[PDB]
Amino acid sequence: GDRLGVLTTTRRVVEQAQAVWIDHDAVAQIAEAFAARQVTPPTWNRELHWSDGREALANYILVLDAVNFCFWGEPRWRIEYAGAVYDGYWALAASLKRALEQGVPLTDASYLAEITRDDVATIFAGEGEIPLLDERARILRETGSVLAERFAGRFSDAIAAAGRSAVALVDIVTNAFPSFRDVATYRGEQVRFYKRAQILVSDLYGAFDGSDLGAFDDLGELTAFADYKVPQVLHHLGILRYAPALHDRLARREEIPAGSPEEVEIRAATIWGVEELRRALASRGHALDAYQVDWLLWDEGQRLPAGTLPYHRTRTIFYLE
Ligand SMILES: Nc1nc2c(c(CN[C@H]3C=C[C@H](O)[C@@H]3O)cn2[C@@H]2O[C@H](COP(=O)(O)O)[C@@H](O)[C@H]2O)c(=O)[nH]1
Ligand SMILES: [N+]
Fold first, then answer.
1. Ligand 1 pocket: which of 199, 233, 270 to mutate (most atoms <8 Å of CB)?
2. Active-site residue 227, yes or no?
């Protein structure tokens, strides 16, 4: 069933986990409510996402998801675009569209391979500064050179080699692009997540409306994308519970080291939180794919009540690259 081993490896963490557990009573109740009013994920957002030709849109999706991480910090990083102030993901998406409309060639492997610290400090210019600026530059350079060297500057070539398999395409991405390699260990066992590689596949589906390069026959094989907003929504809905030390650490906005048992438990329990909710919805005759349940919860996250427990703060590491 699980050809990437996200569900298999995360399942071992959820079974042994000390600081996080699922409230299956709360899963049942949220499923009852969601299935009753037949909730849908939002439509892949056309306004803040770029669109273009086949070849350029494919490379744009790769660039977008290559740097799709870690937006928290003080002072909050914000962007002005089309007379609106944005933060977090929508800041990332706006900053890229803004740069593209002013004809910065971010879709071009040659430009990316070469891109300087100051080129990307400009693209993400606003209140404060995007976290891990230097790292995003390194990742975009890595993305360009791999595109240029292995795929003739066209992500379309990678996508064609996947033969409409979402799972095949994740594996091709992690194999070729080092910075998409999202694995950890728990009590000496490897745990596999592949957040940005899996987001990338769902974003192609969204961008191309499940046609051409966005066509995939096995989207059901995707899991949830183990980020920091979705577990915040599952804690808010009562589905994820946190033990005392972790509850206090999140409340005080203390940072959690990447790959620490607490961070890996939050992420593994996010994967199974979304999975057990998908099962319970299906049981109640509302059959969604795990990525759709993710999109739907991520959307809830964009309008949580002020004074819900803060999201966990992990500074994303690329030590090995
Ligand atoms: N699990 C999951 N995580 C997601 C997304 C998205 C954007 N996807 C779009 C495509 C289809 C959907 O309907 C969305 O419109 C961003 N993130 C993560 O969020 C965090 C920033 O959060 P804030 O500060 O609140 O913007 C950061 O870790 C980023 O990686 C998602 O879909 N699922
Ligand atoms: N969110």
1. 199
2. yes
